[PDB]
Structure 1
Amino acid sequence: QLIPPLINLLMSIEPDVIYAGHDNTKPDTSSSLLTSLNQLGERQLLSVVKWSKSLPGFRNLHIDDQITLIQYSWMSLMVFGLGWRSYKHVSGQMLYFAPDLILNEQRMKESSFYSLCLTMWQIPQEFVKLQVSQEEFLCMKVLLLLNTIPLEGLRSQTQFEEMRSSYIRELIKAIGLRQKGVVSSSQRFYQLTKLLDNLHDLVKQLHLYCLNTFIQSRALSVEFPEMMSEVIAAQLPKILAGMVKPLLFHK
């Protein structure tokens, strides 16, 4: 009723529940956990591709641009969605990767990658502190898809600029749904966009761990499915080397 139409459209095209297909009747091993995380990843990737086809504005960018944005942003979209699920289903106090892959802190501690779990866990904790709304989350998730471009820019740079600006304007409207008053709503825009800026650094730790694990995947018995392997091979070294342009809302 009071919800802006683009936001209702964003809510309508959100994915259904995605399962990891993890055993759970067997004790965790570093290899089985990471394999399920990658299987979950492959499924989430498929879901991003489907979502992106319905995302207003996106289909009108050159196909190369679309592929590039998905390849740059997949880890940040996954970790943001994890943040949201963990916030909404478990009050932020477990990592809700999937309904069949939920790690409470004890399961994190016994994982082999406790510190990485803790890094990821920061996000749901920030959602709790900021009380991020569904409408703000939906807009912020679009901006993450649009949050890095090549050094040379995109083929459809003009159209990207219009689309990114439109979702920023939409995030502003989502904030205005609750944050009444110029000073509160102004501060809120700072905080939410600052959070997105801060994700670049958090995602860099995930990127490095993921790349090392991919390079060592045979030794470590971690499987990487096809689309996951393709995105990692295409872009992660270049992203880690800073040979792309992360977009920031603040200096």
Structure 2
Amino acid sequence: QLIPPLINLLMSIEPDVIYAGHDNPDTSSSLLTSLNQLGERQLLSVVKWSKSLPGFRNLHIDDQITLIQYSWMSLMVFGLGWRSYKHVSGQMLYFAPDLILNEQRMKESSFYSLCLTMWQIPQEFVKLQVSQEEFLCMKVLLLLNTIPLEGLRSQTQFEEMRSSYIRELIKAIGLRQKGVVSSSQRFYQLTKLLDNLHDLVKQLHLYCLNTFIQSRALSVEFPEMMSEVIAAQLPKILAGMVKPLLFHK
């Protein structure tokens, strides 16, 4: 087609729709447990996606697991932004077809604040008019956007993969942004959106880990696979003991 084959591949490997299983009165705590229930199902889906993503299975298995444990929440908030942009024009948060939040369902002050943070992504998607082909290549680069302070075991292959998906994003931008000046500026805008996600996700990581270490008292359930990625890396990530990659100074 005019659509490059790697992008059409990324489109075919996107996860199908995941339901939260929410029991449809609204309450902050039961809402949070439903959000983490959904997060467990989405985590399964991200690891399956990774198994089909070109290049990723060839990195050392420890690097595969480290990059999923670093990037899971960033990938899931970026997909929440896509669904919300696409289904409700960014104006509600479309966590799943059975768990769509508007402002009436955001009652407790810290819950609404966290939603506003997440709401930044679909607002930028609406402003910039991000395309599916852009979003698919961006989402790979977010998987690949933090490494350990000592680097990865397959650092060479990693660097090759990340360059390949930067070239692919350039192709995605080229589908629509025809000028030299305009497609350069578009590359800048998209890559700076990805750099800015590191600071957005830090607030969600802190709230997550604070809730997780008193989850019993809070009556907030975290499922087993999500509890493992939290316990394995979150405190180290929050402490700054990882290397976030940036496109811009």
Normalising by structure 1, report the TM-score. Answer: 0.98
Which residue of 2 is the match for residue 58 of structure 1?
A: 56
After superposition, the CA RMSD in angstroms is 0.9
**Residues 164-211 of structure 1: per-residue CA shift (max 9 Å, x gap):** 010000000000000001000000000000000000000000000000
State the 1:150 CA deviation: 0.1
Determine which of 77, 81, 84 is the counterpart of 2:82. Answer: 84
For residues 139 and 93 of structure 1, the distance between their equivalents in structure 2, rounded to whole angstroms, comes to 24
**Which residue does 1:67 correspond to in 2?**
65
Q: Following the alignment from structure 2 to structure 1, what is the Cα–Cα distance between the partners of residues 215 and 146?
A: 27
Alpha carbons 1:30, 1:112 under 8 Å: kept: no
Asked if structure 1 preserves the Cα contact closer than 8 Å seen for 2:28 and 2:108, the reply is no
SS of equivalent to 1:112 = helix
Match of 1:171 among 169, 172, 175: 169
The question of whether the paired residues in 2 share the 8 Å contact of 1:238 and 1:244 is answered with yes
CA deviations on 1:129-169 (whole Å, 9 max, x unpaired) are: 00000000000000000000000000000000000010000
SS at match of 1:15: coil
Could you tell me how far 1:111 is from its partner in structure 2? 7.1
Q: Which runs of 4+ in 1 moved over 4 A?
A: none
Alignment partners' CA distance in 2, 1:168 and 1:221? 43
Aligned residue pairs: how many? 249
What residue in structure 2 maps to residue 127 of structure 1?
125
How many Å separate the matches in 2 of 1:112 and 1:244? Answer: 27
1:110 Cα deviation from its structure 2 partner: 5.0
Q: CA deviation at 1:28?
A: 1.6
Cα drift, residue 112 of structure 1 = 5.1
The Cα of 1:9 is off from its aligned counterpart by 0.3
1:221 pairs with 2:219: yes
Q: Secondary structure of 2:135's match?
A: helix
SS at match of 1:28: coil
Identity of aligned residues (%): 100
Deviation at 1:106, TM superposition (A): 1.9
Give the CA deviation at 1:108.
Answer: 2.0
8 Å CA contact retained: 1:84, 1:127: yes
> 1:29–1:111: 8 Å Cα contact kept in structure 2?
no
Q: CA deviation at 1:109?
A: 3.8
Alpha-carbon separation, structure 2, partners of 1:96 and 1:138: 18
Q: Which residue of the partner structure matches residue 31 of structure 2?
A: 33
Gaps of 5+ in 1: none
- Give, in whole Å, the separation in 1 of the partners of 2:2 and 2:71: 31
* 8 Å CA contact retained: 2:59, 2:154: yes
| TM-score, normalised relative to structure 2 | 0.99
Q: Residue 96 of structure 1 aligns to a residue in which SS? A: strand
- Matches of 1:117 and 1:49 in 2, distance apart? 25
Q: Distance in 2 between matches of 1:148 and 1:177?
A: 28
Partner of 1:118 in structure 2? 116
